[PDB]
Amino acid sequence: MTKEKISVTVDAAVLAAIDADARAAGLNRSEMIEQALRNEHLRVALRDYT
Amino acid sequence: TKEKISVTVDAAVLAAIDADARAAGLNRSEMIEQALRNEHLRVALRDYT
Amino acid sequence: MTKEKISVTVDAAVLAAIDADARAAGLNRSEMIEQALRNEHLRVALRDYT
Amino acid sequence: TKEKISVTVDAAVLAAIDADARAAGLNRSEMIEQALRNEHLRVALRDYT
Amino acid sequence: TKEKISVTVDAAVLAAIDADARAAGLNRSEMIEQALRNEHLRVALRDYT
Amino acid sequence: MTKEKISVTVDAAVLAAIDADARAAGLNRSEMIEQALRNEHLRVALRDYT
Amino acid sequence: TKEKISVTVDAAVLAAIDADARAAGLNRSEMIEQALRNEHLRVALRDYT
Amino acid sequence: MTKEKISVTVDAAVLAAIDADARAAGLNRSEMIEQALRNEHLRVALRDYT
């Protein structure tokens, strides 16, 4: 299960909110971002491929 | 206003998100922002009670 | 609704079978291949992103 | 035994399949073959009766 | 020109005909048409006289 | 001896001819189609598996 | 032609299948037959090898 | 984790096929039927609720 290190630019309020959610969930930032991306991919797949 | 950050993410998930971004006419940063804004809502979904 | 023309190499028996399914469905080859690809993407999303 | 063919497919679907192929360690032709083999089974799924 | 019909046939025979169709690059309806056209000839085979 | 009910599309002249054969043989349509399919499977087996 | 059998199945799955049957105008046995016929196709789905 | 014992009537050829799949998968009959029912519920949900 390999990983890539990437640089991204994100709205400061969006970032602060998901950082607060990461803390509540006991996740670090990269772990909560991965979770968000996995769920968003599923959102898009269910919307566009059903 | 916008912050540049460095994160480490699963390579397969990143390739999938890059393809979803292309379909949407977005770049990677925009698609990641879409995901993070929606995830703040999804983590609040609950079972009763 | 943009499309791309591509060249692909496919097993002849696999191709003949899905061409027969396309004929039964009233689809041309490209339409049936598109259907197969959409459904396969959903297969992979449900397997790996749930 | 293998046939080279030309087909025209939705660009968003192709990008999604390319990313699924990368995740699987496959090239485009192999992932397309996976999809076509499986679709021959899926079209036979039915409701009763 | 072509007629859509419902028929009830032995399940083992149907599975065999489906596999013969696949081998021939045909779908079920085409293989059934092959069989029905040929059976019109076979029923006319005779012993002397 | 289980059976399956199926929908198929057949050339009208081919169907009319085998219906006329069914009547001559005292068979209903499904019985004559089953006979045709059994004999065709044997045709293919003798051609391809001997 | 049809066999009567006794099986033990998760109660939540059974309730879900009962509701799907009602939606389809089927009884439990018919919806279970739909599922078993389709599952014989699904277990044959594969990744490229 | 609770289970229910039920009686059902199933086409003999359908049953024989899924019994053969159960053997190939190392499952008993009830385990393979449960798998079939879970996957069929998902089939119906994705078809009707997306």
mmCIF file of C-alpha atoms in Angstrom:
data_model
loop_
_atom_site.group_PDB
_atom_site.id
_atom_site.type_symbol
_atom_site.label_atom_id
_atom_site.label_comp_id
_atom_site.label_asym_id
_atom_site.label_seq_id
_atom_site.Cartn_x
_atom_site.Cartn_y
_atom_site.Cartn_z
ATOM 1 C CA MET A 1 0.000 0.000 0.000
ATOM 2 C CA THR A 2 2.326 2.787 -1.177
ATOM 3 C CA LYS A 3 1.900 6.488 -0.517
ATOM 4 C CA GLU A 4 2.855 9.666 -2.371
ATOM 5 C CA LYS A 5 3.888 12.955 -0.761
ATOM 6 C CA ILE A 6 2.128 15.859 -2.493
ATOM 7 C CA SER A 7 1.764 19.611 -2.131
ATOM 8 C CA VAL A 8 -1.724 21.123 -2.332
ATOM 9 C CA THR A 9 -3.317 24.510 -1.794
ATOM 10 C CA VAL A 10 -6.504 24.466 0.274
ATOM 11 C CA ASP A 11 -8.881 27.114 1.623
ATOM 12 C CA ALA A 12 -7.795 27.954 5.181
ATOM 13 C CA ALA A 13 -11.289 27.563 6.660
ATOM 14 C CA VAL A 14 -11.854 24.178 4.977
ATOM 15 C CA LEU A 15 -8.470 23.023 6.294
ATOM 16 C CA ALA A 16 -9.095 24.237 9.811
ATOM 17 C CA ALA A 17 -12.448 22.441 9.910
ATOM 18 C CA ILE A 18 -11.138 19.094 8.751
ATOM 19 C CA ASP A 19 -8.135 19.447 11.095
ATOM 20 C CA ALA A 20 -10.637 19.859 13.947
ATOM 21 C CA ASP A 21 -12.450 16.738 12.730
ATOM 22 C CA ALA A 22 -9.135 14.844 12.572
ATOM 23 C CA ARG A 23 -8.404 15.746 16.192
ATOM 24 C CA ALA A 24 -11.869 14.561 17.274
ATOM 25 C CA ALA A 25 -11.333 11.282 15.411
ATOM 26 C CA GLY A 26 -7.801 10.722 16.702
ATOM 27 C CA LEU A 27 -6.373 10.918 13.157
ATOM 28 C CA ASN A 28 -3.432 12.903 11.909
ATOM 29 C CA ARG A 29 -3.964 15.297 9.016
ATOM 30 C CA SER A 30 -2.794 12.947 6.250
ATOM 31 C CA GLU A 31 -5.003 10.142 7.603
ATOM 32 C CA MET A 32 -8.106 12.354 7.668
ATOM 33 C CA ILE A 33 -7.334 13.687 4.178
ATOM 34 C CA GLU A 34 -7.035 10.127 2.863
ATOM 35 C CA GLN A 35 -10.391 9.317 4.467
ATOM 36 C CA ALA A 36 -11.985 12.379 2.813
ATOM 37 C CA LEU A 37 -10.579 11.423 -0.598
ATOM 38 C CA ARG A 38 -11.753 7.804 -0.346
ATOM 39 C CA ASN A 39 -15.256 8.895 0.586
ATOM 40 C CA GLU A 40 -15.369 11.576 -2.105
ATOM 41 C CA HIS A 41 -14.338 9.062 -4.763
ATOM 42 C CA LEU A 42 -17.234 6.876 -3.651
ATOM 43 C CA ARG A 43 -19.583 9.890 -3.763
ATOM 44 C CA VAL A 44 -18.563 10.549 -7.365
ATOM 45 C CA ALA A 45 -18.747 6.891 -8.364
ATOM 46 C CA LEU A 46 -22.275 6.450 -6.968
ATOM 47 C CA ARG A 47 -23.434 9.656 -8.610
ATOM 48 C CA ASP A 48 -21.945 9.092 -12.056
ATOM 49 C CA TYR A 49 -21.578 5.301 -12.513
ATOM 50 C CA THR A 50 -24.933 3.958 -11.402
ATOM 51 C CA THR B 1 -6.831 32.736 2.602
ATOM 52 C CA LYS B 2 -5.515 29.548 0.942
ATOM 53 C CA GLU B 3 -2.702 27.547 2.571
ATOM 54 C CA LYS B 4 -0.096 25.389 0.802
ATOM 55 C CA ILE B 5 0.467 22.115 2.669
ATOM 56 C CA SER B 6 2.368 18.874 2.233
ATOM 57 C CA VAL B 7 0.557 15.574 2.850
ATOM 58 C CA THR B 8 1.199 11.881 2.260
ATOM 59 C CA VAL B 9 -1.632 9.865 0.755
ATOM 60 C CA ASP B 10 -2.248 6.426 -0.666
ATOM 61 C CA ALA B 11 -1.093 6.356 -4.295
ATOM 62 C CA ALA B 12 -4.157 4.472 -5.582
ATOM 63 C CA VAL B 13 -6.560 6.918 -3.920
ATOM 64 C CA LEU B 14 -4.636 9.825 -5.377
ATOM 65 C CA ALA B 15 -4.834 8.414 -8.902
ATOM 66 C CA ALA B 16 -8.599 7.929 -8.498
ATOM 67 C CA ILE B 17 -9.081 11.505 -7.244
ATOM 68 C CA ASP B 18 -6.927 12.847 -10.125
ATOM 69 C CA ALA B 19 -9.247 11.106 -12.579
ATOM 70 C CA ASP B 20 -12.362 12.417 -10.816
ATOM 71 C CA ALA B 21 -10.827 15.905 -10.987
ATOM 72 C CA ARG B 22 -10.259 15.621 -14.724
ATOM 73 C CA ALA B 23 -13.857 14.507 -15.269
ATOM 74 C CA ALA B 24 -15.032 17.550 -13.316
ATOM 75 C CA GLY B 25 -12.703 20.001 -15.067
ATOM 76 C CA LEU B 26 -10.863 20.579 -11.773
ATOM 77 C CA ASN B 27 -7.247 20.402 -10.800
ATOM 78 C CA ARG B 28 -6.001 18.257 -7.913
ATOM 79 C CA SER B 29 -6.120 21.034 -5.310
ATOM 80 C CA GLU B 30 -9.731 21.935 -6.192
ATOM 81 C CA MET B 31 -10.904 18.294 -6.075
ATOM 82 C CA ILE B 32 -9.138 17.828 -2.728
ATOM 83 C CA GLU B 33 -10.913 20.935 -1.416
ATOM 84 C CA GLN B 34 -14.253 19.495 -2.626
ATOM 85 C CA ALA B 35 -13.542 16.289 -0.695
ATOM 86 C CA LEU B 36 -12.464 18.056 2.505
ATOM 87 C CA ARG B 37 -15.487 20.351 2.562
ATOM 88 C CA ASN B 38 -17.840 17.408 2.083
ATOM 89 C CA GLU B 39 -16.034 15.228 4.586
ATOM 90 C CA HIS B 40 -16.732 17.775 7.338
ATOM 91 C CA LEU B 41 -20.429 17.033 6.690
ATOM 92 C CA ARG B 42 -20.054 13.264 6.356
ATOM 93 C CA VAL B 43 -18.269 12.790 9.691
ATOM 94 C CA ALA B 44 -21.361 14.266 11.326
ATOM 95 C CA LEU B 45 -23.698 11.582 9.919
ATOM 96 C CA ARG B 46 -25.056 9.468 12.789
ATOM 97 C CA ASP B 47 -27.196 6.529 13.705
ATOM 98 C CA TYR B 48 -30.101 7.103 16.077
ATOM 99 C CA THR B 49 -29.516 8.219 18.686
ATOM 100 C CA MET C 1 -20.253 14.215 -23.260
ATOM 101 C CA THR C 2 -16.822 14.151 -24.940
ATOM 102 C CA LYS C 3 -15.375 10.910 -26.314
ATOM 103 C CA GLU C 4 -11.874 9.702 -27.146
ATOM 104 C CA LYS C 5 -10.872 7.272 -29.922
ATOM 105 C CA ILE C 6 -8.427 4.659 -28.609
ATOM 106 C CA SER C 7 -6.647 1.540 -29.786
ATOM 107 C CA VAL C 8 -6.800 -1.483 -27.487
ATOM 108 C CA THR C 9 -5.668 -5.097 -27.725
ATOM 109 C CA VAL C 10 -8.212 -7.593 -26.375
ATOM 110 C CA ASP C 11 -8.447 -11.382 -26.206
ATOM 111 C CA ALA C 12 -10.396 -12.586 -29.250
ATOM 112 C CA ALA C 13 -12.769 -14.807 -27.276
ATOM 113 C CA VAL C 14 -13.538 -12.014 -24.777
ATOM 114 C CA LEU C 15 -14.237 -9.665 -27.694
ATOM 115 C CA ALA C 16 -16.444 -12.106 -29.548
ATOM 116 C CA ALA C 17 -18.527 -12.716 -26.417
ATOM 117 C CA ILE C 18 -19.127 -9.063 -25.659
ATOM 118 C CA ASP C 19 -19.859 -8.382 -29.357
ATOM 119 C CA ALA C 20 -22.543 -11.078 -29.152
ATOM 120 C CA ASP C 21 -23.936 -9.384 -26.043
ATOM 121 C CA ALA C 22 -23.910 -6.037 -27.842
ATOM 122 C CA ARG C 23 -25.941 -7.484 -30.704
ATOM 123 C CA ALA C 24 -28.468 -8.934 -28.228
ATOM 124 C CA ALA C 25 -28.730 -5.550 -26.522
ATOM 125 C CA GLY C 26 -29.058 -3.526 -29.718
ATOM 126 C CA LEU C 27 -25.788 -1.696 -28.980
ATOM 127 C CA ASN C 28 -22.816 -1.102 -31.211
ATOM 128 C CA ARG C 29 -19.380 -2.222 -30.037
ATOM 129 C CA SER C 30 -18.269 1.135 -28.621
ATOM 130 C CA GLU C 31 -21.556 1.548 -26.723
ATOM 131 C CA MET C 32 -21.249 -1.893 -25.130
ATOM 132 C CA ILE C 33 -17.593 -1.330 -24.260
ATOM 133 C CA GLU C 34 -18.525 1.957 -22.578
ATOM 134 C CA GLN C 35 -21.205 0.141 -20.590
ATOM 135 C CA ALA C 36 -18.679 -2.506 -19.506
ATOM 136 C CA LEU C 37 -16.180 0.147 -18.407
ATOM 137 C CA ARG C 38 -18.755 2.121 -16.405
ATOM 138 C CA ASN C 39 -19.913 -1.006 -14.608
ATOM 139 C CA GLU C 40 -16.359 -2.175 -13.958
ATOM 140 C CA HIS C 41 -15.426 1.186 -12.441
ATOM 141 C CA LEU C 42 -18.389 0.806 -10.099
ATOM 142 C CA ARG C 43 -17.290 -2.748 -9.255
ATOM 143 C CA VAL C 44 -13.838 -1.464 -8.278
ATOM 144 C CA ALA C 45 -15.199 1.533 -6.356
ATOM 145 C CA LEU C 46 -17.587 -0.614 -4.281
ATOM 146 C CA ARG C 47 -14.848 -3.143 -3.577
ATOM 147 C CA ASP C 48 -12.082 -0.712 -2.628
ATOM 148 C CA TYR C 49 -13.793 2.509 -1.384
ATOM 149 C CA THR C 50 -16.512 1.293 1.010
ATOM 150 C CA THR D 1 -5.476 -14.793 -30.245
ATOM 151 C CA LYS D 2 -5.582 -11.089 -29.304
ATOM 152 C CA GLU D 3 -7.152 -8.513 -31.634
ATOM 153 C CA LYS D 4 -6.199 -4.840 -31.919
ATOM 154 C CA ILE D 5 -9.317 -2.684 -32.281
ATOM 155 C CA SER D 6 -10.269 0.978 -32.379
ATOM 156 C CA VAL D 7 -13.169 2.211 -30.230
ATOM 157 C CA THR D 8 -14.618 5.539 -29.120
ATOM 158 C CA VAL D 9 -15.398 5.902 -25.424
ATOM 159 C CA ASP D 10 -16.480 8.639 -23.064
ATOM 160 C CA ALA D 11 -13.414 10.562 -21.928
ATOM 161 C CA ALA D 12 -14.402 10.689 -18.251
ATOM 162 C CA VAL D 13 -14.983 6.932 -18.172
ATOM 163 C CA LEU D 14 -11.629 6.316 -19.819
ATOM 164 C CA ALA D 15 -9.818 8.458 -17.269
ATOM 165 C CA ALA D 16 -11.504 6.543 -14.434
ATOM 166 C CA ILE D 17 -10.564 3.172 -15.966
ATOM 167 C CA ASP D 18 -6.950 4.348 -16.468
ATOM 168 C CA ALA D 19 -6.736 5.161 -12.765
ATOM 169 C CA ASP D 20 -8.277 1.813 -11.793
ATOM 170 C CA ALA D 21 -5.711 0.132 -14.038
ATOM 171 C CA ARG D 22 -2.866 1.975 -12.361
ATOM 172 C CA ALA D 23 -4.127 0.927 -8.931
ATOM 173 C CA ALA D 24 -4.235 -2.691 -10.107
ATOM 174 C CA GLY D 25 -0.796 -2.648 -11.763
ATOM 175 C CA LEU D 26 -2.464 -3.129 -15.172
ATOM 176 C CA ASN D 27 -2.231 -1.261 -18.427
ATOM 177 C CA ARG D 28 -5.324 0.075 -20.232
ATOM 178 C CA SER D 29 -5.764 -2.956 -22.487
ATOM 179 C CA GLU D 30 -5.650 -5.382 -19.531
ATOM 180 C CA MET D 31 -8.165 -3.367 -17.458
ATOM 181 C CA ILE D 32 -10.446 -3.124 -20.498
ATOM 182 C CA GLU D 33 -10.227 -6.908 -20.904
ATOM 183 C CA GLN D 34 -11.118 -7.311 -17.202
ATOM 184 C CA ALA D 35 -14.195 -5.134 -17.737
ATOM 185 C CA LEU D 36 -15.321 -6.940 -20.890
ATOM 186 C CA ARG D 37 -14.962 -10.406 -19.359
ATOM 187 C CA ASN D 38 -16.974 -9.352 -16.323
ATOM 188 C CA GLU D 39 -19.613 -7.533 -18.333
ATOM 189 C CA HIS D 40 -20.466 -10.777 -20.157
ATOM 190 C CA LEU D 41 -21.509 -12.099 -16.731
ATOM 191 C CA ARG D 42 -23.273 -8.932 -15.545
ATOM 192 C CA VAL D 43 -25.559 -8.707 -18.585
ATOM 193 C CA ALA D 44 -26.909 -12.130 -17.596
ATOM 194 C CA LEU D 45 -28.029 -10.961 -14.147
ATOM 195 C CA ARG D 46 -31.835 -11.061 -13.935
ATOM 196 C CA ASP D 47 -34.875 -10.409 -11.827
ATOM 197 C CA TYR D 48 -37.199 -13.314 -11.095
ATOM 198 C CA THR D 49 -38.439 -14.850 -13.240
ATOM 199 C CA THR E 1 -39.269 -10.055 -39.727
ATOM 200 C CA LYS E 2 -37.977 -11.386 -36.378
ATOM 201 C CA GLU E 3 -40.395 -12.519 -33.658
ATOM 202 C CA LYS E 4 -39.804 -12.384 -29.896
ATOM 203 C CA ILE E 5 -41.194 -15.490 -28.156
ATOM 204 C CA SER E 6 -41.204 -17.175 -24.757
ATOM 205 C CA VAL E 7 -40.402 -20.869 -24.458
ATOM 206 C CA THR E 8 -39.626 -23.281 -21.653
ATOM 207 C CA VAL E 9 -36.671 -25.561 -22.189
ATOM 208 C CA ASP E 10 -34.612 -28.033 -20.231
ATOM 209 C CA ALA E 11 -32.025 -26.189 -18.146
ATOM 210 C CA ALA E 12 -29.157 -28.569 -18.952
ATOM 211 C CA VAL E 13 -29.801 -28.290 -22.700
ATOM 212 C CA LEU E 14 -29.921 -24.516 -22.426
ATOM 213 C CA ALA E 15 -26.566 -24.385 -20.646
ATOM 214 C CA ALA E 16 -25.034 -26.599 -23.336
ATOM 215 C CA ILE E 17 -26.409 -24.409 -26.139
ATOM 216 C CA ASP E 18 -25.158 -21.264 -24.359
ATOM 217 C CA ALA E 19 -21.639 -22.726 -24.322
ATOM 218 C CA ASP E 20 -21.880 -23.729 -27.992
ATOM 219 C CA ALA E 21 -23.010 -20.171 -28.750
ATOM 220 C CA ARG E 22 -20.031 -18.715 -26.926
ATOM 221 C CA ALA E 23 -17.657 -20.976 -28.846
ATOM 222 C CA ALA E 24 -19.202 -19.797 -32.111
ATOM 223 C CA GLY E 25 -19.191 -16.095 -31.218
ATOM 224 C CA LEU E 26 -23.006 -16.113 -31.181
ATOM 225 C CA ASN E 27 -25.591 -15.021 -28.692
ATOM 226 C CA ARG E 28 -28.356 -17.342 -27.449
ATOM 227 C CA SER E 29 -30.952 -16.169 -29.961
ATOM 228 C CA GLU E 30 -28.581 -16.692 -32.915
ATOM 229 C CA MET E 31 -27.558 -20.214 -31.766
ATOM 230 C CA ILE E 32 -31.237 -21.095 -31.243
ATOM 231 C CA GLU E 33 -31.969 -19.872 -34.781
ATOM 232 C CA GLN E 34 -29.112 -22.055 -36.086
ATOM 233 C CA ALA E 35 -30.626 -25.071 -34.312
ATOM 234 C CA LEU E 36 -34.180 -24.431 -35.555
ATOM 235 C CA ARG E 37 -33.126 -23.943 -39.173
ATOM 236 C CA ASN E 38 -31.104 -27.164 -39.093
ATOM 237 C CA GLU E 39 -33.816 -29.121 -37.314
ATOM 238 C CA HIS E 40 -36.242 -28.422 -40.176
ATOM 239 C CA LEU E 41 -33.787 -30.421 -42.323
ATOM 240 C CA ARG E 42 -33.100 -33.179 -39.802
ATOM 241 C CA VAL E 43 -36.778 -34.045 -39.258
ATOM 242 C CA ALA E 44 -36.911 -34.885 -42.972
ATOM 243 C CA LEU E 45 -34.149 -37.527 -42.755
ATOM 244 C CA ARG E 46 -35.626 -40.966 -43.468
ATOM 245 C CA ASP E 47 -34.964 -44.661 -43.710
ATOM 246 C CA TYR E 48 -35.669 -46.377 -47.030
ATOM 247 C CA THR E 49 -38.393 -46.233 -48.126
ATOM 248 C CA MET F 1 -35.502 -32.604 -15.231
ATOM 249 C CA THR F 2 -35.660 -28.844 -14.546
ATOM 250 C CA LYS F 3 -36.734 -26.301 -17.151
ATOM 251 C CA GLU F 4 -36.105 -22.588 -17.635
ATOM 252 C CA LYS F 5 -38.444 -20.046 -19.246
ATOM 253 C CA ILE F 6 -36.606 -17.772 -21.688
ATOM 254 C CA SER F 7 -37.285 -15.022 -24.186
ATOM 255 C CA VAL F 8 -35.691 -15.277 -27.629
ATOM 256 C CA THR F 9 -35.849 -13.501 -30.959
ATOM 257 C CA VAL F 10 -36.097 -15.758 -34.009
ATOM 258 C CA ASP F 11 -36.542 -15.170 -37.738
ATOM 259 C CA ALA F 12 -40.262 -15.431 -38.558
ATOM 260 C CA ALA F 13 -39.806 -17.864 -41.443
ATOM 261 C CA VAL F 14 -37.537 -20.129 -39.387
ATOM 262 C CA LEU F 15 -40.131 -20.153 -36.592
ATOM 263 C CA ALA F 16 -43.058 -20.785 -38.925
ATOM 264 C CA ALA F 17 -41.250 -23.782 -40.438
ATOM 265 C CA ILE F 18 -40.359 -25.415 -37.158
ATOM 266 C CA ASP F 19 -43.883 -24.740 -35.850
ATOM 267 C CA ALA F 20 -45.210 -26.616 -38.880
ATOM 268 C CA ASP F 21 -42.818 -29.484 -38.090
ATOM 269 C CA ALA F 22 -43.982 -29.478 -34.461
ATOM 270 C CA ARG F 23 -47.586 -29.824 -35.580
ATOM 271 C CA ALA F 24 -46.687 -32.743 -37.876
ATOM 272 C CA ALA F 25 -44.834 -34.438 -35.010
ATOM 273 C CA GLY F 26 -47.547 -33.865 -32.415
ATOM 274 C CA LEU F 27 -45.228 -31.644 -30.319
ATOM 275 C CA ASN F 28 -45.861 -28.253 -28.843
ATOM 276 C CA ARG F 29 -43.492 -25.405 -29.663
ATOM 277 C CA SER F 30 -41.292 -25.737 -26.577
ATOM 278 C CA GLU F 31 -40.999 -29.504 -27.071
ATOM 279 C CA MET F 32 -39.878 -29.098 -30.666
ATOM 280 C CA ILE F 33 -37.439 -26.326 -29.763
ATOM 281 C CA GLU F 34 -35.909 -28.561 -27.086
ATOM 282 C CA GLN F 35 -35.541 -31.353 -29.656
ATOM 283 C CA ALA F 36 -33.827 -28.943 -32.053
ATOM 284 C CA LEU F 37 -31.400 -27.732 -29.378
ATOM 285 C CA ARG F 38 -30.462 -31.258 -28.252
ATOM 286 C CA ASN F 39 -29.786 -32.319 -31.816
ATOM 287 C CA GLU F 40 -27.819 -29.155 -32.561
ATOM 288 C CA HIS F 41 -25.625 -29.690 -29.501
ATOM 289 C CA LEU F 42 -24.863 -33.177 -30.814
ATOM 290 C CA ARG F 43 -24.090 -31.734 -34.262
ATOM 291 C CA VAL F 44 -21.559 -29.352 -32.711
ATOM 292 C CA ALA F 45 -20.046 -31.988 -30.421
ATOM 293 C CA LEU F 46 -19.491 -34.460 -33.281
ATOM 294 C CA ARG F 47 -18.016 -31.725 -35.465
ATOM 295 C CA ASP F 48 -15.674 -30.196 -32.916
ATOM 296 C CA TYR F 49 -14.882 -32.922 -30.328
ATOM 297 C CA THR F 50 -14.045 -36.017 -32.412
ATOM 298 C CA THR G 1 -38.397 -29.647 -10.097
ATOM 299 C CA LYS G 2 -38.270 -27.476 -6.925
ATOM 300 C CA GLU G 3 -36.842 -28.643 -3.585
ATOM 301 C CA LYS G 4 -37.938 -27.535 -0.117
ATOM 302 C CA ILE G 5 -34.912 -26.892 2.122
ATOM 303 C CA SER G 6 -34.169 -25.577 5.590
ATOM 304 C CA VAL G 7 -31.437 -22.947 5.994
ATOM 305 C CA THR G 8 -30.208 -20.645 8.751
ATOM 306 C CA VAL G 9 -29.535 -17.054 7.750
ATOM 307 C CA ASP G 10 -28.711 -13.782 9.419
ATOM 308 C CA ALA G 11 -31.910 -12.198 10.691
ATOM 309 C CA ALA G 12 -31.071 -8.688 9.456
ATOM 310 C CA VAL G 13 -30.303 -9.959 5.949
ATOM 311 C CA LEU G 14 -33.553 -11.909 5.917
ATOM 312 C CA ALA G 15 -35.578 -8.824 6.858
ATOM 313 C CA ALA G 16 -33.866 -6.838 4.081
ATOM 314 C CA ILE G 17 -34.574 -9.542 1.487
ATOM 315 C CA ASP G 18 -38.220 -9.757 2.672
ATOM 316 C CA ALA G 19 -38.603 -6.033 2.017
ATOM 317 C CA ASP G 20 -36.941 -6.291 -1.393
ATOM 318 C CA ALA G 21 -39.331 -9.138 -2.213
ATOM 319 C CA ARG G 22 -42.341 -7.061 -1.237
ATOM 320 C CA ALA G 23 -41.155 -4.191 -3.425
ATOM 321 C CA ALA G 24 -40.825 -6.597 -6.349
ATOM 322 C CA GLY G 25 -44.175 -8.308 -5.794
ATOM 323 C CA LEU G 26 -42.372 -11.548 -4.907
ATOM 324 C CA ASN G 27 -42.573 -13.895 -1.975
ATOM 325 C CA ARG G 28 -39.502 -14.903 0.047
ATOM 326 C CA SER G 29 -38.830 -18.106 -1.916
ATOM 327 C CA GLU G 30 -38.931 -16.281 -5.278
ATOM 328 C CA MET G 31 -36.580 -13.485 -4.089
ATOM 329 C CA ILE G 32 -34.200 -16.090 -2.657
ATOM 330 C CA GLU G 33 -34.210 -17.877 -6.013
ATOM 331 C CA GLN G 34 -33.426 -14.548 -7.745
ATOM 332 C CA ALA G 35 -30.447 -14.083 -5.414
ATOM 333 C CA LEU G 36 -29.104 -17.629 -5.854
ATOM 334 C CA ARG G 37 -29.327 -17.524 -9.648
ATOM 335 C CA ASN G 38 -27.507 -14.203 -9.745
ATOM 336 C CA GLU G 39 -24.910 -15.261 -7.214
ATOM 337 C CA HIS G 40 -23.794 -18.107 -9.500
ATOM 338 C CA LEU G 41 -22.823 -15.364 -11.987
ATOM 339 C CA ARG G 42 -21.268 -12.999 -9.443
ATOM 340 C CA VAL G 43 -18.877 -15.610 -7.988
ATOM 341 C CA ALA G 44 -17.404 -15.891 -11.498
ATOM 342 C CA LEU G 45 -16.442 -12.197 -11.658
ATOM 343 C CA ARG G 46 -12.647 -11.844 -11.721
ATOM 344 C CA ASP G 47 -9.732 -9.466 -11.772
ATOM 345 C CA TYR G 48 -7.420 -9.705 -14.770
ATOM 346 C CA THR G 49 -4.911 -12.528 -14.310
ATOM 347 C CA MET H 1 -25.188 -11.712 15.068
ATOM 348 C CA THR H 2 -28.585 -13.453 15.256
ATOM 349 C CA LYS H 3 -29.820 -16.008 12.718
ATOM 350 C CA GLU H 4 -33.214 -17.409 11.781
ATOM 351 C CA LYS H 5 -34.016 -20.909 10.532
ATOM 352 C CA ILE H 6 -36.364 -20.827 7.539
ATOM 353 C CA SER H 7 -37.886 -23.176 5.010
ATOM 354 C CA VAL H 8 -37.763 -22.232 1.332
ATOM 355 C CA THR H 9 -38.613 -23.840 -1.976
ATOM 356 C CA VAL H 10 -35.963 -23.362 -4.666
ATOM 357 C CA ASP H 11 -35.554 -24.568 -8.249
ATOM 358 C CA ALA H 12 -33.444 -27.750 -8.158
ATOM 359 C CA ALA H 13 -31.008 -26.615 -10.840
ATOM 360 C CA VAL H 14 -30.486 -23.227 -9.171
ATOM 361 C CA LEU H 15 -29.793 -25.008 -5.886
ATOM 362 C CA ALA H 16 -27.400 -27.517 -7.407
ATOM 363 C CA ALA H 17 -25.403 -24.725 -9.044
ATOM 364 C CA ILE H 18 -25.032 -22.642 -5.914
ATOM 365 C CA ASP H 19 -24.203 -25.789 -3.895
ATOM 366 C CA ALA H 20 -21.368 -26.445 -6.349
ATOM 367 C CA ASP H 21 -20.175 -22.864 -5.899
ATOM 368 C CA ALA H 22 -20.323 -23.293 -2.110
ATOM 369 C CA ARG H 23 -18.104 -26.362 -2.328
ATOM 370 C CA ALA H 24 -15.610 -24.488 -4.505
ATOM 371 C CA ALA H 25 -15.582 -21.628 -2.002
ATOM 372 C CA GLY H 26 -15.247 -23.826 1.081
ATOM 373 C CA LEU H 27 -18.649 -22.636 2.399
ATOM 374 C CA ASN H 28 -21.586 -24.634 3.644
ATOM 375 C CA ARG H 29 -24.978 -24.122 2.037
ATOM 376 C CA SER H 30 -26.337 -21.643 4.599
ATOM 377 C CA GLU H 31 -23.136 -19.572 4.378
ATOM 378 C CA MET H 32 -23.329 -19.375 0.592
ATOM 379 C CA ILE H 33 -27.030 -18.542 0.689
ATOM 380 C CA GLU H 34 -26.342 -15.722 3.143
ATOM 381 C CA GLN H 35 -23.643 -14.424 0.795
ATOM 382 C CA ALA H 36 -26.070 -14.526 -2.150
ATOM 383 C CA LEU H 37 -28.726 -12.643 -0.198
ATOM 384 C CA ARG H 38 -26.324 -9.928 0.987
ATOM 385 C CA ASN H 39 -25.091 -9.359 -2.556
ATOM 386 C CA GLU H 40 -28.594 -9.368 -3.986
ATOM 387 C CA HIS H 41 -29.750 -6.759 -1.469
ATOM 388 C CA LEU H 42 -26.851 -4.589 -2.606
ATOM 389 C CA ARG H 43 -27.801 -5.174 -6.255
ATOM 390 C CA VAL H 44 -31.342 -3.969 -5.536
ATOM 391 C CA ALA H 45 -30.210 -0.996 -3.439
ATOM 392 C CA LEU H 46 -27.802 0.245 -6.126
ATOM 393 C CA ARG H 47 -30.428 -0.188 -8.828
ATOM 394 C CA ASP H 48 -33.339 1.448 -7.015
ATOM 395 C CA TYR H 49 -31.859 3.876 -4.434
ATOM 396 C CA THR H 50 -29.210 5.824 -6.387
#
